[model samples]
Target chain A: PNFSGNWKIIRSENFEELLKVLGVNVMLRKIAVAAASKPAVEIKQEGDTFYIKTSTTVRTTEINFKVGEEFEEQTVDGRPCKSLVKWESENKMVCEQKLLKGEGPKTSWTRELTNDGELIETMTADDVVCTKVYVRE
Target chain B: PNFSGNWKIIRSENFEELLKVLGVNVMLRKIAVAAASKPAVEIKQEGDTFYIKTSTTVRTTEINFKVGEEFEEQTVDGRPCKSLVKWESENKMVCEQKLLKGEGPKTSWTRELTNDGELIETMTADDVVCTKVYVRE
Candidate 1:
């Protein structure tokens, strides 16, 4: 899987709902929605682990994990969660996060590289789903 | 009813539950609850309008308003809210806050100065209540 590289966000849909469900306030949510709302990511894989770093105008987030491992994490905005990452297929990766010590809407994310080479990141929490499309930077 | 002073927090009850109901994540709630968890505030009143500044190790908050006037505000933690302040009695001041542009537990806060000279801040959200006691510095 070509998961290691610098990636830039192309678009996002229903992103505000994700923040709303997580109890993020309206002011910060609006700022995030207004910011280019575009984020960039850098990923690296070594041994059985992967390092994923994402950057937006407001904050930077970093996470490291291996397949099928559950770990604790705090988002860049300071929300705490439990996360798990796994490889779903040769070109697809999936992850899940539960906020506030396994509270809030349990969120699932899928990352896949299309034949056209676009990195599509899909995030779902309850009935709300957000998709962030990306391309190699 | 001297509500204006340099007040230092003495203790809190059910603060964590308040955070939980508001959907604030654990990482921040933990840090806040664990930080000696004491906050300080100094209030100033000039004619009909009042200014209040509060500080904790994690953040500082400032708000200004007149009695019975509803206005928009963002909390120190960046949560957007609508707040209204009024004097319930000579010794008690009441304020109400609601999540900005959304449905959330409408919170009511009452600040009272006891005859014993302690300042008690009582916060109620639906049925959940939190008490923060303070003393003059």
Candidate 2:
């Protein structure tokens, strides 16, 4: 419950490797790494509709979805994909992304609010796991 | 004085034309319009250091600068520039960006918080003016 707020990224783990796995170019990868160092995120929940925005120095990305409904999404690195988000529980949301181009591995994201009231997003793709922790502003 | 929070874009005017003047590709311009339709932004102020993050469905961009200090920035669309942000007053913050590319015109952005707590960002470039309004989430 109550997942609407502005969150600032405090730390990220394995983010650069994760971007590499997603086929991001070297120049963009360097920019992405520097950007992710202090990213900001926002999550808005309106009844069954959920909106998520991820912001950094390199780029800003957003996704809008209703529970269990599939929607088209473009990845931060410009990869086209289809995504479906569903609530695993009151505090846990999971998203599955299927790439629309070529034969790329599917990506999964798990977002949950910790007991300490911090937001944690775990992204997994191609055996790479990147965790980003955010604190409420 | 406390402009720290997540803000969501509710409306925008002339943003598409601004992108066109910046020479963004047709496909990217379409993506930019779709993304700006419901953008999210974050602002943080720690003493004189200010951080701003703007996120959309397509990209996320961040900028960090101290009031009155000029710094180098790369635009979300990959244009390099030098920028300076200064407080026009307690509530109004203004930024001037001088493009580094050959023969590119300078751009200016003004951000102000309204009495109703809305964040308004007006950007001007090449005789085009774009206004984006955001509300605290």
Candidate 3:
């Protein structure tokens, strides 16, 4: 995935609420909107192997994996929770997450490219869920 | 504060999303809504000290606290996070929470009562945020 473009969260449904239920406070939420505006996503795909980096104002994180391969993932914020990401289907990335000490349940983040300019990200955690639709600008 | 009453989450503006980001699965989300159908809340207030209990189908939990006092709180669902809560102002409750693990952020929840008897729940953690409203009958 070539994540080298300006992206804005055109429609973010339930994500804000998800953060609040997790007990996130107002100061951070205000900063998040600014961070999401200039998300820096770097993807290096080399013949079935890929390296991706997601960077923001507060934190910068990266992921490296290959199709059908399982790799560990640590969130950008460096929380202790760990996860494994695998290719569930073509253009679909699925992750199985293990909750850390303060974490709640096994969760997953899935990404799918609807078209050349559209991407959809879905996250499921515990009993709560959210979906974000991203359009490249 | 009187932490006793049959309270229902009449409105949760962003709380659901915050929970999702924390890795709460779909089943738990579904259960949480119905679990509180008969949402019975009982409280024992002794001067500035209080003990509150919530009953639901999925689980029953209790919280003990005092105005301007702080203590460790274990989320009823067994998440590995601990929280400290205190009364910040009249009719205002503030909490600070730390998660032992995961990519999730340390979050907080603030609650207060409105003039019309609506309970407002606000959450914030890192970049995710949301709100919920509960109407008491």
- Fnat (0 to 1) per candidate: 0.00, 0.00, 0.00
DockQ of 1: 0.01
Q: For candidate 1, write residues A1-137 as lDDT tens digits.
A: 56778998776655665576567899978888786656899988674477889887767888888878997786424668788878888778888777765445556777777766777777666544566777887
For candidate 2, give the docking quality class from DockQ.
incorrect
What is the descending DockQ order? 3, 2, 1
Model 2 iRMSD vs. native: 14.4
Task: Give per-residue lDDT, candidate 1, residue B50.
Answer: 78
User: In candidate 1 chain A, what residue range of length 10 has the lowest lDDT sum?
Assistant: A98-107
Ranking by lDDT: 2, 1, 3
Instruction: Tell me the TM-score of each prediction against the true structure.
Output: 0.48, 0.48, 0.45
Among these predicted structures, which one has the highest lDDT? 2
Q: What would the per-residue lDDT of candidate 2 be over residues B5-52, giving only the tens digit for each residue?
A: 999877666566567757888887787788454678989989779888
The best candidate by DockQ is 3
State the weakest 10-residue window (summed lDDT) of model 2 chain A: A29-38
**Model 1 lDDT on a 0 to 1 scale:** 0.73
